[PDB]
Amino acid sequence: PLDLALKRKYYEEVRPELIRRFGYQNVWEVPRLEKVVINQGLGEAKEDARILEKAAQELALITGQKPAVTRAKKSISNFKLRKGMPIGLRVTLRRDRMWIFLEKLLNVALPRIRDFRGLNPNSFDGRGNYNLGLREQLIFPEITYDMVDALRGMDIAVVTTAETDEEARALLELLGFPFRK
């Protein structure tokens, strides 16, 4: 499925404008959106694989991709975790798999976010990267209402090939990332 609105948006719209604002030398100095990863730190369904599955396959639909598990290492008596038994539901995705998800996101999810006001401008980690938390996971397309047995949210991170985050700010704004500014 090599082709899509957002896929091209970057090329035939954003990309060239970056050359305006910064204007590099080589085509590979122009900042690439190239990595996006979901995650669900769930010490919640940590007990049972029942509450753990639905959140995984649910995740699977929104991403469209096959979600991965992540086990604990240390040990937390304060919140009942030892060897690695438990869980965090993370899933990496790139290529066109990600463009398709970002379209949904920046144009369907963020929109239906209760009293949205634009992605926090400060969520950039000094380097060319951005992350954000989300409550209700139902703000995703295919997700039905009668489907959710819990409002288990989650958080995501998106990587650039940029070095500084002004380039990432510029890059993301252009790509349709509504920032609170």
């Binding site: 609105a5 397309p141 349709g176």
Partner: peptide, 30 residues
Amino acid sequence: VPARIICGCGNVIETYSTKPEIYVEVCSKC
């Protein structure tokens, strides 16, 4: 499949995601 984001404010978007019956309430067109 090619998804179909049907919203009450036009903006009917296609992409890819199982079952294209995507009735979006208030999409980014508004």
